Design a protein around this ligand. Sequence first.
Ligand SMILES: *[C@@H]1O[C@H](CO)[C@@H](O[C@@H]2O[C@H](CO)[C@@H](O)[C@H](O)[C@H]2NC(C)=O)[C@H](O)[C@H]1NC(C)=O
Length: 49
Amino acid sequence: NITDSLSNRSLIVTTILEEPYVLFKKSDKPLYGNDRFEGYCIDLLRELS
Ligand SMILES: *[C@@H]1O[C@H](CO)[C@@H](O[C@@H]2O[C@H](CO)[C@@H](O)[C@H](O)[C@H]2NC(C)=O)[C@H](O)[C@H]1NC(C)=O
């Protein structure tokens, strides 16, 4: 059981804008939250979450 034992526990994740790892979502609405950045390491963040 190495499942979601880290539930709750709001956490701060820091990044730098690089070209192939993070990118803004191309949309009309102003981006807020985890929809601000998308990419491969963001996909790794989704898998880890
Ligand atoms: C996250 O917070 C919730 C409450 O805010 C914790 O909830 C309890 O979880 C245990 C697990 O068996 C239950 O028996 C309790 O009835 C729950 N209480 C409530 C008030 O929900 C939860 O454990 C927390 N997550 C972690 C990983 O600690």
